[PDB]
Amino acid sequence: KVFGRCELAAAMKRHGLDNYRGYSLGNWVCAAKFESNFNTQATNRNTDGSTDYGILQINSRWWCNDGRTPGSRNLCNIPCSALLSSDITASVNCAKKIVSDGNGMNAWVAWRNRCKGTDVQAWIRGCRL
Numbered sequence: 001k002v003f004g005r006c007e008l009a010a011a012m013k014r015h016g017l018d019n020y021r022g023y024s025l026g027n028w029v030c031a032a033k034f035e036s037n038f039n040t041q042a043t044n045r046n047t048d049g050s051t052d053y054g055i056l057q058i059n060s061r062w063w064c065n066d067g068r069t070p071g072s073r074n075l076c077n078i079p080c081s082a083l084l085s086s087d088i089t090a091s092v093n094c095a096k097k098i099v100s101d102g103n104g105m106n107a108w109v110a111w112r113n114r115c116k117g118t119d120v121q122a123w124i125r126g127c128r129l
Ligand SMILES: [Cl-]
Pocket: 021, 102, 103, 104, 105
């Protein structure tokens, strides 16, 4: 599913990401934009052999099992394919564990390089939230 911007902002709020670990909703929408282009089916291989999955590009190196990332962890206790659903529940639940692990949103390379320190409130402008 390719979410609209305000559609994703509304789903992310419904699921408790607005101000989660102190990150406003616009940070999460900006991260999803530059990680996945709002596409739940996005997958991208990493140089170490892991893959990133879904709207927030969650890495099989630590967070999910994809059956082909040796010596990796599954800290969200899920198959990586769960993170590709039209239902973002599994991605949001797992993202809450990631952002809580001490690194905050710096875990998301696209967030650090493209959203951090910008006017992220712009990502929720015009949405009826
Ligand atoms: Cl933090």
